């Protein structure tokens, strides 16, 4: 009640260490153990909360690994002080994890902080708790109890950060670290719940990663398929391996077509490339109304011709906007090459035939929807206008864009890769990619509950929730439980047993 909690802890440490040698020289061994028992009651006995809540969490936040190990000793010797240690420090885990994801204004940085708290608690176990396992039990319990509460802020932020770690830079060439931080991704986000939204978003992420730019590594994606195969269903990693098999099918079609133009001897500059896919293992894509230069339409018909062979049973529903393409660009003061997107490639295709178009037939002769075309003009316009030049300036954009293509263009590099768009995405794009999972759980829980009542006739709702939580990779809301109860009654697999929702039957 005079010194600080760490000061009193060091005093207790040294004062207990005093009482040994008293016996060692002169006092009695058989009263050494009564002496330490009494003294440890006098110092540490009956003070296992006012030392061990604040002065625990205070010196954990200060993270003095010497005194944390000291109190670990000083409360692993004592009568039961490690129980107070486990409870106070585990509540400390829950709250000091909870100081991340419940913050809706602070979603720009969540994943790195989660990695940080994971790292800190791991280090406090491995030295400050000296690889005891009770602490690990409280850790995992506390983490899962925490993240059952917010499922679909983290898994989406986590998916974006997983994709961010799946980028090809010049800074990283040791994928071993990215293997190790990938191991931390798997282990740490096994605490994070709602994995179906992460799963579908990772379909979106491999789409946005292959379709523009290039991945961090081949073995990185292979290791992720093998790792995410674990901890989820074995029919939950059928689509991803289907992605890479469909990519190999498209490459084999590429080899076949290149061999079939080996005797036609292409020397022309105009290229067509379609990597074709099936809708069972990929994100779904529906064509949107867009306008194509008629030679591209000729290439579409060529694509039909080479499409109709090789496992016929095939019928066109084409996409002609989702790729990125390399293009040479005429300007004054040099001819450099652009790596750009099809939304912008059509823009640049019209800025060959003339300079002087306006947003009316830029809206029309592209055909591009408003949501895509605004963000198309947020790249290389709304700033840095030396290729396209848009009459509204700044973040605010009005419907009056007047364009005259610029002769002037300056940069110090070749292969001018100015392409945010397809390695970016919009808010309602993310929201819609979430709703394609929201009322997609419907058939999942439908199948699960029809199988349950086909297995056990009576099951209260507080047990249906637990069987579903056992079975599924995401947490099911109480609203969705009412939703499936009512729809099962609509399709005659439930009857309310005893005229209340307490129990049910499988009678129609």
């Amino acid at each position: 009640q005079e010194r600080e909690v760490p000061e009193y802890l060091n005093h207790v440490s040294k004062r207990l260490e005093e009482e040994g040698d008293r016996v060692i020289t002169y006092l009695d061994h058989s009263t050494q153990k009564p002496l330490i028992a009494c003294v440890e009651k006098q110092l540490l006995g009956e003070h296992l909360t006012a030392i061990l809540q604040k002065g625990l969490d205070h010196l954990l936040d200060e993270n003095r690994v010497p005194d944390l190990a000291q109190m670990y000793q000083l409360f692993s010797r004592v009568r039961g002080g490690q129980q107070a240690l486990l409870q106070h420090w585990s509540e400390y885990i829950k709250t000091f994890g909870t100081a991340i994801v419940i913050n809706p204004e602070k979603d720009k940085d969540m994943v790195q902080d989660l990695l940080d708290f994971k790292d800190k608690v791991d280090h406090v176990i491995e030295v400050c708790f000296q690889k005891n396992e009770r602490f690990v039990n409280l850790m995992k319990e506390s983490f899962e109890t925490f993240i059952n509460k917010r499922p679909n802020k983290p898994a989406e932020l986590i998916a974006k950060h997983v994709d961010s770690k799946l980028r090809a830079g010049n800074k990283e060439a040791t994928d071993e670290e990215l293997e190790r931080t990938l191991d931390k991704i798997m282990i740490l986000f096994r605490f994070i719940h709602g994995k179906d939204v992460f799963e579908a978003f990772y379909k979106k992420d491999l789409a946005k990663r292959l379709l523009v730019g290039k991945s961090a590594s081949v073995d990185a994606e292979k290791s992720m398929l093998s790792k995410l195969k674990h901890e989820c269903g074995a029919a939950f990693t059928s689509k991803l391996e289907g992605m890479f098999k469909d990519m190999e099918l498209s490459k084999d079609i590429m080899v076949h077509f290149k061999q079939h133009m080996q005797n036609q001897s292409d020397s022309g500059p105009i290229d067509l490339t379609v990597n074709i896919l099936t809708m069972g293992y990929w994100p779904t894509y529906t064509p949107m109304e867009v306008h194509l230069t008629p030679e591209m339409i000729k290439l579409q018909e060529v694509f039909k011709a080479f499409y109709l062979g090789k496992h016929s049973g095939r019928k066109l529903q084409w996409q002609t906007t989702l790729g990125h393409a390399v293009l040479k660009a005429e300007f004054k003061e040099g001819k450099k090459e652009f790596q750009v997107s099809l939304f912008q490639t059509l823009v640049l295709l019209m800025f060959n035939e003339g300079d002087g178009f306006s947003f009316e037939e830029i809206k029309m002769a592209t055909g591009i929807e408003d949501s895509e075309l605004r963000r198309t003009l947020q790249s290389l316009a709304c700033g840095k206008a030396r290729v396209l030049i848009k009459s509204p300036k700044g973040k605010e954009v009005e419907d009056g864009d007047k364009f005259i293509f610029n002769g002037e263009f300056k940069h110090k590099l070749f292969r001018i890769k100015i392409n945010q768009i397809q390695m970016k995405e919009t808010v309602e794009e993310q929201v819609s990619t979430t709703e394609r999972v929201f009322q997609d759980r419907q058939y999942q829980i439908d199948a699960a509950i029809v199988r349950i009542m086909k297995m056990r006739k009576t099951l209260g709702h507080n047990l249906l929730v637990s069987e579903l939580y056992n079975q599924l990779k995401f947490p099911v809301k109480p609203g969705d439980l009412k939703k499936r109860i009512e729809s099962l009654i609509d399709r005659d697999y439930m009857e309310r047993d005893k005229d209340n929702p307490n129990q049910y039957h499988y009678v129609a």
Partner: peptide, 21 residues
């Protein structure tokens, strides 16, 4: 020949079903 001379068009797309449900 043009202000962008066409060197590469590349696309990703889906091959679709053709059997009755």
């Amino acid at each position: 020949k043009k202000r962008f001379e066409v060197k590469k068009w590349n696309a990703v797309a889906l091959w679709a079903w053709d059997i009755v449900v």
